[PDB]
Design an enzyme around this catalytic site. Sequence first.
Site, PDB file in Angstrom:
ATOM      1  N   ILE A  21      71.542 125.486  89.934  1.00 33.56           N
ATOM      2  CA  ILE A  21      71.996 125.544  90.533  1.00 33.56           C
ATOM      3  C   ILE A  21      72.086 125.150  91.978  1.00 33.56           C
ATOM      4  CG2 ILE A  21      74.242 126.304  91.739  1.00 33.56           C
ATOM      5  CD1 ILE A  21      73.511 125.524  88.149  1.00 33.56           C
ATOM      6  N   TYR A  26      68.040 136.102  97.920  1.00 31.54           N
ATOM      7  CA  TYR A  26      66.928 136.537  97.298  1.00 31.54           C
ATOM      8  C   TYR A  26      66.514 136.215  96.530  1.00 31.54           C
ATOM      9  CZ  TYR A  26      69.337 140.545 100.071  1.00 31.54           C
ATOM     10  OH  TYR A  26      69.847 140.580 101.207  1.00 31.54           O
ATOM     11  N   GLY A  27      67.066 134.889  96.012  1.00 34.10           N
ATOM     12  CA  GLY A  27      66.468 133.885  94.288  1.00 34.10           C
ATOM     13  C   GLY A  27      66.644 132.642  94.548  1.00 34.10           C
ATOM     14  N   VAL A  29      69.877 130.527  91.729  1.00 31.73           N
ATOM     15  CA  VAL A  29      70.675 130.747  90.975  1.00 31.73           C
ATOM     16  C   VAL A  29      70.707 129.859  90.103  1.00 31.73           C
ATOM     17  CG1 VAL A  29      73.298 131.085  90.424  1.00 31.73           C
ATOM     18  CG2 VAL A  29      72.229 132.298  92.550  1.00 31.73           C
ATOM     19  N   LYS A  44      72.288 135.129  89.028  1.00 29.60           N
ATOM     20  CA  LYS A  44      71.313 135.671  90.092  1.00 29.60           C
ATOM     21  C   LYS A  44      70.063 135.762  89.884  1.00 29.60           C
ATOM     22  CE  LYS A  44      74.454 138.320  93.000  1.00 29.60           C
ATOM     23  NZ  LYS A  44      74.645 137.748  94.160  1.00 29.60           N
ATOM     24  N   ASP A 139      82.326 140.229 105.455  1.00 27.68           N
ATOM     25  CA  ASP A 139      81.363 138.622 105.667  1.00 27.68           C
ATOM     26  C   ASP A 139      82.341 137.702 104.208  1.00 27.68           C
ATOM     27  OD1 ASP A 139      79.293 137.348 106.342  1.00 27.68           O
ATOM     28  OD2 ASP A 139      78.058 137.365 104.803  1.00 27.68           O
TER      29      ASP A 139
END
EC number: 2.7.11.24
Length: 340
Positions: A21, A26-27, A29, A44, A139
């Site tokens: 995707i 931190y990676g 998806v 994820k 956020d």
Amino acid sequence: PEMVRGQVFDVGPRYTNLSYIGEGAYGMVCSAYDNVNKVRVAIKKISPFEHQTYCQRTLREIKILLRFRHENIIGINDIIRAPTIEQMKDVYIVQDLMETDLYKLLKTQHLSNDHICYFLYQILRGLKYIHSANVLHRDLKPSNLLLNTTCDLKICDFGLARVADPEYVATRWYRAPEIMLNSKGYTKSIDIWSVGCILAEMLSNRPIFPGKHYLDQLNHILGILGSPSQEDLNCIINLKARNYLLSLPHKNKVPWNRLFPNADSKALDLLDKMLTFNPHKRIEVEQALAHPYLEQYYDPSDEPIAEAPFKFDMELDDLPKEKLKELIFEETARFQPGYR
């Protein structure tokens, strides 16, 4: 292990037929087919263990999302990681597949009033639940508002969330002025500001308070709201900040109907109340839901709250990354084969 665009994505045999995707934090998806539930899901990959800050955000997100249960907040369906702490280098978080997000949508689509109203309702309904748990998201931004193909919306990314009591981001345009001015005493009101910035952006397809740094953003804010009044200036508990603001030339308020004259007047009235400089005068989540703009949705019996406020056992800010790894190992254990 299954492989995706160079990288290990070791989620079989339960999760197969992977499709990249994009990138989270931190990676990568991917979407995957869940051979148990017989549905496609999002996965994820997180690799946080070499950085204390990445571990804090991963632990915060896992703990909060596992505790929360609400239609407008993304859940955690499953977590995949090694059977022993020593072998755990990556954690895979499995969630409902949400095909897009408000950031992607706004890139290409001009939204109708009907959709803007419906999205704004769902954002506030989820936010009511978050705030009732005594949690600040901190956020909120379009890329954190996930959407599926039928306009269902879910808030995600609680990596920066905090339990309420009066940090690098790529995206600063949704931050409250009191945060940018380094004032003492932030509240749930910072999240309402963010929602106001989102509503403005739904109205115009561009950020309402852009800028290359906080001072440039503050100039954009003051260019629209006008110079703060004396009482609102005094709400800033930072003398250097107050002096800085006093150094700027005077600016008159630009009425929201002048900027967005196509907009529904009720939408603008609610925008006005979300985007007040003084956080003490800013509308709260429950009052916002009760605003005339949302009247076709507003249903307090169908706007649930958390069973009890959220509580972190420990302050995470101080913990070494090795201690945080232990807490993440513990937190993720419920998904393990043979867990009891």
